Amino acid sequence: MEQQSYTIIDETGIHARPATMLVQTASKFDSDIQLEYNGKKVNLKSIMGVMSLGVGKDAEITIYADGSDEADAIQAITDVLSKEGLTE
């Protein structure tokens, strides 16, 4: 039942670094985190979910973990999505 909205600048998006990160990070907790967009709502699956919503520069999102380690997820999940801001 946790959640966290953001505003990144990765005009490239969830590349090989943030993608592989969310895979292990999210898969670790196992809880389903629904990562939304300024005009969309899906799971931050990276494989396509994030691609569809487009996580470019200034990309606004809203994540929600609902499973078991839904809180711990938010923290480590940030570091992951936070990596996107380390680009442009």
Active site residue 15: yes
Spot the catalytic one: 4, 6, 9, 15. Answer: 15
C-beta separation of 63 from 33 below 8 A: yes
Experimental method for this entry?
A: NMR
Domain boundaries 1-88, CATH class? alpha beta
Give the phi and the psi of residue 19 in degrees, each rounded to 5.
Answer: -65, -65
Reduced to 3 states, what is the DSSP secondary structure of residue 34? strand
Nearest to 6 by CA among 69, 28, 14: 14
The domain limits of the chain are 1-88
> Is the C-alpha dihedral spanning 57, 31, 79, 74 positive or negative?
positive
| Beta partners for residue 65, in sequence order | 2, 33
